[PDB]
Amino acid sequence: MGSWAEFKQRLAAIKTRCQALGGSEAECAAFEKEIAAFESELQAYKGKGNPEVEALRKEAAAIRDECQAYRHN
Known part of the structure; x- marks a missing residue:
């Protein structure tokens, strides 16, 4: 399983907060x-x-694009 769990959690939180844009x-x-x-x-x-x-x-790429489309588009 490696350390995919950790990366999955952190990635999920980043994508969620990024998609919601608190x-x-x-x-x-x-x-x-x-x-x-x-x-x-x-x-x-x-x-x-x-x-x-x-x-x-x-996922990472998607998050980056979103961030740039929020404060760089």
Whole structure:
């Protein structure tokens, strides 16, 4: 199972708060950064295109786009 559970939880909270946009110029930033390191950390594991990093990569990218579309569009 590895540490997918942790990444799943944190990722879920980031996506939820990002999709809902509680209303904080900082929150959005924290998500973009956190997500960036998440995908970069998962892709550094080993499998550049592993099946596990696939999901995290997709969700992460989505979150980043949303944040940019909220305070950069």
